[PDB]
Scaffold this motif. Structure first.
Motif: not given
Ligand SMILES: Cc1sc2c(c1C)C(c1ccc(Cl)cc1)=N[C@@H](CC(=O)OC(C)(C)C)c1[nH]nc(C)[n+]1-2
Ligand SMILES: Cc1sc2c(c1C)C(c1ccc(Cl)cc1)=N[C@@H](CC(=O)OC(C)(C)C)c1[nH]nc(C)[n+]1-2
Lengths: 107, 107
Positions: B44, B71, B67-68, B95, B78-79, B75, B63-64, B98
């Motif tokens: 993604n 994230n 937020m996703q 982050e 980091y992956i 992420t 808003a969530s 954020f």
């Protein structure tokens, strides 16, 4: 705090009760699960047991600090595992609930 | 929304101005950067340009949901990257901001 108490009482409690939460109750045991590369791939292990303990001991200085540990917990899972793995899909479900509850937090 | 308007006006605006934000203004260009495995490791893709556009087009239902996407953006970084890489440390800084701003969001 109103916010830190909410992270303990609503966020941890909601997630702990979820059917997918069980892998995250305690630290990843790289020995028991035979994961020799786990600790070299994942530099900041995190789990919900640890978060819950930290909240009870007033470890955190802010709700955002706690939020960070949750993000780390989930991210570790996406870093270590393949995108189609069951554990990834479980983490995604839990992370969504985490975010939905974070959005309903008091200011 | 009070919350979605806040994600556009405070969260995106604060992050966009940050000195470390530039890699996240647009989608990772796996061709220009010569990353042949990027799209098979990262299922993604997400970037702040995309988030900003989505906010302006009222893509999000909550808003969530926004937020996703943030994230996911972090992420992914980091992956794909090693834990000591500059881009990882930059993402961690962003982050943190954020999360600090998410914690100060209205309910
Ligand atoms: C107690 C814990 S902690 C955990 C797992 C379990 C069981 C599972 C797991 C949990 C649930 C389902 Cl349905 C599938 C796997 N996987 C490992 C990684 C792994 O590869 O473990 C196996 C070698 C596959 C055991 C992993 N990564 N991150 C975490 C938090 N976990
Ligand atoms: C425009 C963009 S988007 C981006 C990068 C850049 C430049 C950088 C990068 C950005 C800043 C610094 Cl200081 C270092 C690297 N790295 C790639 C991955 C990579 O390996 O790219 C190089 C092959 C190293 C170019 C990556 N992953 N995730 C993201 C968001 N990015």
């Amino acid at each position: 705090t109103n916010q830190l108490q909410y992270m303990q009482n609503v966020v941890v409690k909601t997630l702990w009760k979820h059917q997918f939460a069980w892998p995250f109750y305690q630290p990843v045991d790289a020995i028991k699960l035979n994961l020799p590369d786990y600790h070299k791939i994942i530099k900041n292990p995190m789990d919900m047991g640890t978060i819950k303990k930290r909240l009870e001991n007033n470890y955190y200085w802010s709700a955002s600090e706690c939020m960070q540990d949750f993000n780390t917990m989930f991210t570790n899972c996406y870093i270590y595992n393949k995108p189609t793995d069951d554990i990834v899909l479980m983490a995604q479900a839990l992370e969504k609930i985490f975010l939905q509850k974070v959005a309903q937090m008091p200011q």
